[PDB]
Amino acid sequence: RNLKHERFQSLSFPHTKEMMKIFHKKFGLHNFRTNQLEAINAALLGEDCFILMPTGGGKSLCYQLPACVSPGVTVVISPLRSLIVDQVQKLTSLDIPATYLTGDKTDSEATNIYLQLSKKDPIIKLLYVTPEKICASNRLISTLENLYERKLLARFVIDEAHCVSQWGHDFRQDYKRMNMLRQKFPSVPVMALTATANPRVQKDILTQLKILRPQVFSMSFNRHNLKYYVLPKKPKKVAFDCLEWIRKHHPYDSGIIYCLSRRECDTMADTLQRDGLAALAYHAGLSDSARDEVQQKWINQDGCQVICATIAFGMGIDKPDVRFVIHASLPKSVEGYYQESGRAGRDGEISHCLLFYTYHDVTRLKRLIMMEKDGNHHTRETHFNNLYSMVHYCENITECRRIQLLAYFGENGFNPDFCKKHPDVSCDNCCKTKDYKTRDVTDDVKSIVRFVQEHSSSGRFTMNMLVDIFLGSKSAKIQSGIFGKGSAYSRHNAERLFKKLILDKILDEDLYINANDQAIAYVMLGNKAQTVLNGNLKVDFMETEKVSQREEMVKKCLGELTEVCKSLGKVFGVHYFNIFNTVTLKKLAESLSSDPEVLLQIDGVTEDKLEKYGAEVISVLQKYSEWTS
DNA sequence: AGCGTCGAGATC
DNA sequence: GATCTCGACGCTCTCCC
Ligand SMILES: Nc1ncnc2c1ncn2[C@@H]1O[C@H](COP(=O)(O)OP(=O)(O)O)[C@@H](O)[C@H]1O
Ligand SMILES: [Zn+2]
């Protein structure tokens, strides 16, 4: 399914002259990434395009570049004004005419937009818009209708297209009403983009939007620049480990910490602030005035380094230079973990994804499923399925996590040499230095299964009890059926081995509620236990035991350049990263050159940007002129 | 009633 | 010095918009 659009890879096309002209001089880029040239060409031939790329893939270019090289205006549908504002700010920073009708623009300002569009001489190529605006306001419609007639409606871009699927992680009703846009404007090319790896959703997007035979541009959803860590969660020193970790690796960079509840966010946020870390809580419990102040401070890096957010609310804001993302608890599913931690490092620079794990968090999350009241169906059983798939990600400490994540989406092709060919972004499992031998413990398992069967006739021994008992400890509750046999086993391997008999469907768990809300998991038996007792299924387990002077100047240079962007930001009324992105800055500093003939040969440096932001930047770069050796 | 935490003492 | 064990003591949160 990962096709090759050999037809669209040619530079022989008529538009190719002007397109490359805008690609080099307006955007300032030099080389296309995977499926970029193919997707761009296709869009410019009037084809219905469907873009599937992971975060940071390069989805923005697939519609932003065609709009610049097209008669008329491209109409882009986005789900949030926050996303819209960020993209328009990036575009206006390149002197590319664009604006938006989100709804919080007063009718007077709104009308000024409709004016520039009506002249039929519009200089504006990109018009971002929210879905309820199209649905509710028939004022917008009467404008578009005029553009269609003069053949100036270039195409309908549908950003975040996964919002149309009820099977998607972010469903929106107004996206269902997008089919009415194609009905009135059938001649107009439609383009859908998404960063969803879930194929069942990818398929559903096409079915719901009723796009007739599109060009499907797929890609490997492996996140090339994310370091995946799983770490042992000693509860109650999460904040300390986060504080310690952040200060060690990324003391002066923004990040996110995801917590299950609004309260735990406040708690996490509180602990960090009083120790001198710029942390704020972020969730739906905040007043609207508060919410706006948080995102002001976090996005612009003005008095807030870290937000402590609930998953639902954390999706609502973003910045491209998020250097780390920490999950304080255990995510509900692997797709969820992937999309959540995936939003780190959109700017393509290395970023870290830390999951704090303990199996205790499982029983908590297990009870949440039982409680909630939309209806206890055998679909909510699947919420349990996803959960088990998540634990597997955490318990698997040998197989490359990149393979594990992609395997969950069923991605085929990925080379397991990646972490080895790319040491700088290796995951923890491939980071783990030593080897381990797998042994057969069927003998040991039989005794165990027998033990549980005897005292169950729900359950009467939790995992901890069972481990203490089988470890031959002195905290053990009963020294009868298997006391002292896992004497060989450490309390690390004894633990994991017990975590692996609840993952092979060998021992299920009991969810008794307590004399209080925190539920306990008594151990029972798992269906497959007899296929083991039959003399059939075999079991296996795997016991687990200076800077140089020029390099010093680029650091100093890069330091000043960042603040200059921050200042230019407040002046031009724009986020600091919509001036120069992190990669642009990093390459500028490493040249130490003031020669514009060398600077324009760097990604992100354009004639316009080096003209209205140049003077301030070149001044700083002049100081290091005597170092460009 | 289970469960981390954590100081004191065993063990390497 | 660093990791383990024991066992007394203290806290346990139907989540998210
Ligand atoms: N082909 C490319 N060449 C150079 N830089 C690129 C390219 N594509 C994207 N980028 C850079 O990557 C950053 C984010 O890419 P973006 O298109 O926003 O990814 P996505 O839209 O998938 O989130 C942008 O700041 C842009 O400068
Ligand atoms: Zn790996």
Numbering used by the authors: 637 to 1093, 1106 to 1193, 1207 to 1290
From the publication, what sentences describe this entry?
In order to gain insight into the mode of BLM DNA binding we have determined the crystal structure of BLM, in the absence of a nanobody, but in complex with ADP and two different DNA oligonucleotides, containing 12 bp of duplex DNA with either a 5 or a 12 nucleotide 3′ overhang. The best diffraction (3.5-Å resolution) was obtained for BLM DNA crystals with the 5 nucleotide overhang (complex I); crystals containing a 12 nucleotide overhang (complex II) diffracted less well (4.5-Å resolution). Clear electron density can be observed in complex I for the entire length of the DNA, the duplex region of which is positioned between the D2 domain, the Zn2+ binding domain and the WH domain. The majority of the contacts to the duplex DNA are formed via the WH domain, which contacts DNA primarily via the N-terminus of the second helix and the extended loop between the second and third helices, forming an approximately equal number of polar contacts to each strand. Consistent with a role in strand separation, the β-hairpin on the WH domain is positioned at the interface between the double- and single-stranded regions on the minor groove face. In contrast, the β-hairpin of BLM lacks these aromatic residues, instead forming an extensive and predominantly polar interface with the final paired base of the duplex region. In BLM the DNA duplex is almost perpendicular to the 3′ overhang, whilst in the HsRECQ1 DNA complex it is almost parallel. The positioning of the dsDNA also allows an interaction with a region outside the WH domain: a lysine/proline-rich loop (residues 868PKKPKK873) that connects the first β-strand to the first α-helix of the D2 domain. The five bases of the 3′ overhang stretch from immediately after the β-hairpin and pass close to the helical hairpin of the Zn2+ binding domain to contact the D2 domain. The first three bases on the 3′ overhang are flipped out, pointing in the opposite direction to their predecessors, in a manner that resembles the flipped bases in the SF1 helicase PcrA.
